[PDB]
Amino acid sequence: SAKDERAREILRGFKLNWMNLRDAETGKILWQGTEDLSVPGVEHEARVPKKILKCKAVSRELNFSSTEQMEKFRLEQKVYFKGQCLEEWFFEFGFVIPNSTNTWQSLIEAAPESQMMPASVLTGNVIIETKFFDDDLLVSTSRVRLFYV
Template identity: 45%
Template structure:
């Protein structure tokens, strides 16, 4: 099996306790936006290992994650996973293998580069903790060793 790996990392921020004395309250949700540049050759692999690494400074009673891959704003892939309890001050990792579509269904890197967005939402039960949006660019030279 020919596999490649892409890794996206996010950290769920922990708000300070609310205090009626100070009137200060940090929202419990955060939205992070990143870009990722991957080698265009990744689109020709039969499968890709995707690893999601996440950390939390506080306990989470019932972590669940949803992820959508959007191309030109249309969902082409969706999945959800339930992780359950997350230990405070822990770093956790979850990996899965994504099988590629058939060669006849593949799209050229130039067409989807910058037009592919991976949206990951972290929840504690039904409460949104954090949203991570990654815009993916494909580069013919990314990942190559200089000669």
């Protein structure tokens, strides 16, 4: 077999069960989702309250299940506005035990400029591209268009 097949095995057995975002300054829920936004090869859409743009720090919880073991599960996210990448984020979970369900909590502090850009201009014009990796092995690339409501 080969690295490409190993990456497909991981993807086959992976799923995102639920996700939430909280305002880190209060611990209050801002948004909750239950779509598996890890699914590649299609474009997804997420509708999120515009208050998220005005938060200096957002705590994100991603709950996921993995059939396969991963030595170093990590994410790369890029935020594109009208085709231009305005921000890049790197997150690391680490070792994933086979046949496990896990909650990954990450603090996200977006660029201060994003807190003043009008939601009316951003809405429907932002794509978050996420690349799921096991160390340097690309498992999936997903794309989600954001709407700020």
